[PDB]
């Protein structure tokens, strides 16, 4: 009878894991300082531990429940969001990352409720929205700082995608809530180390100028909408536009099933390495409403610096196509076209939002 393979007992992520049969998933308590259940997959056939490490996505710090309790006691959403921003400044575990994003979603719904109750009210609504937005922009900045990225990697691939997608979704939704509570003309720009957000509400009457984002920022990415596009999308004489860019988020938006077109062989830079990667920041433009899927006669144009030029090729202009229901997605090239590309930069034109 040929041998069975087993993983060795190992301490990984400060959890002691038992000797385990190949193929088995094992559960153990989350590490000291957190609550929840951790798991670790012993790979089938190999009898080696999953090289990505244990799944700590269920492991949370005490502050997560504290914030959840503030929500129950009916505290103001903007104020709670501010506490969340503070908590994410420090050490955070994988479970804290996804909980933070879920908490921002919950807070957005609470905020929207408070806003409908104020349907001096107008300036109050605006102040409250801006307070919320500043808090979530800070929270996102905290979650994407380089020292927080290892915590994201303590979630499995699917949880990383789900969390990143929820993050993209909640920030955009929050931005459009702000757009509903400012008076034209308005421009609100918030620039941080790992995220920049702009909300602008403009009249389409008379002279309209193209929009270029960001401003006040030495950017690795920029995006623009033509004056005609703005005119063509007028609603009651106004347009509401949301722009966002993110640093490091692309790490988590998996290229599995990406619909890219390769003109050559894709390899890797190491054993078990990736052959297709997001090689730019993620940069977003939306008009009037989230997920409009509107066709643009004048395409949106964006230019990005490559994160690493060396040993990469075959730039493909893409957008994140995701389901609001499942919060999962994939990169699609549909309706996007490469305008120019060299070793260090690519310019793209996409015919839709």
């Amino acid at each position: 009878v040929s041998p069975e393979l087993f993983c060795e007992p190992r301490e990984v992520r400060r959890v002691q894991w038992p000797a385990t049969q190949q193929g088995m998933l094992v559960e153990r308590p989350c590490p000291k300082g957190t609550r929840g259940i951790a798991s670790f997959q012993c790979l089938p056939a190999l009898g080696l531990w999953n090289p990505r490490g244990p799944d700590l996505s269920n492991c949370t710090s005490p502050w997560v429940n504290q914030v959840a309790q503030k929500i129950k006691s009916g505290e103001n959403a903007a104020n709670i969001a501010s506490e969340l921003a503070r908590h994410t400044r420090g050490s955070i575990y994988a479970g804290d990352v996804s909980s933070s994003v879920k908490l921002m979603e919950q807070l957005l719904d609470i905020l929207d409720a408070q806003l409908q109750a104020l349907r001096n009210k107008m300036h109050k609504r605006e102040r409250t929205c801006k307070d919320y937005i500043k808090a979530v922009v800070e929270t996102v900045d905290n979650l994407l700082r380089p020292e927080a990225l290892e915590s994201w990697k303590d979630m499995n691939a699917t949880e990383q995608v789900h969390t990143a997608t929820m993050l993209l979704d909640v920030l955009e939704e929050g931005a459009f809530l702000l757009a509903d509570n400012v008076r034209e003309p308005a421009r609100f720009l918030a620039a941080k180390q790992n995220v920049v957000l702009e909300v602008t509400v403009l009249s389409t009457e008379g002279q309209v100028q193209e929009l270029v984002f960001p401003q006040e920022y030495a950017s690795e990415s920029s995006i623009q909408l033509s004056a005609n596009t703005i005119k063509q999308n007028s609603r009651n004489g106004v347009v509401k536009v949301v722009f966002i860019l993110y640093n490091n988020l692309g790490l988590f938006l998996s290229t599995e099933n990406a619909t890219v077109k390769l003109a050559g062989e894709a390899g890797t830079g190491g054993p078990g390495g990736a052959s297709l990667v997001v090689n730019s920041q993620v940069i977003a433009a939306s008009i009037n409403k989230e997920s409009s899927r509107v066709f643009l006669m004048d395409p949106v144009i964006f230019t990005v610096a490559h994160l690493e030029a060396k040993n990469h090729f075959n730039a493909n202009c893409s957008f994140w196509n995701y389901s609001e229901r499942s919060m999962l997605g994939y990169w699609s090239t549909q309706g996007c076209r490469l305008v120019e590309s060299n070793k260090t930069h690519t310019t793209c034109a996409c015919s839709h939002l």
Binding site: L253, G264, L276, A284, A285, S318
Partner: peptide, 15 residues
């Protein structure tokens, strides 16, 4: 809508 540029890692090296 959220946009980015994907790239492949090289496989083949000559000369």
């Amino acid at each position: 809508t959220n946009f980015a540029v994907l790239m492949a890692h090289r496989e083949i090296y000559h000369h």
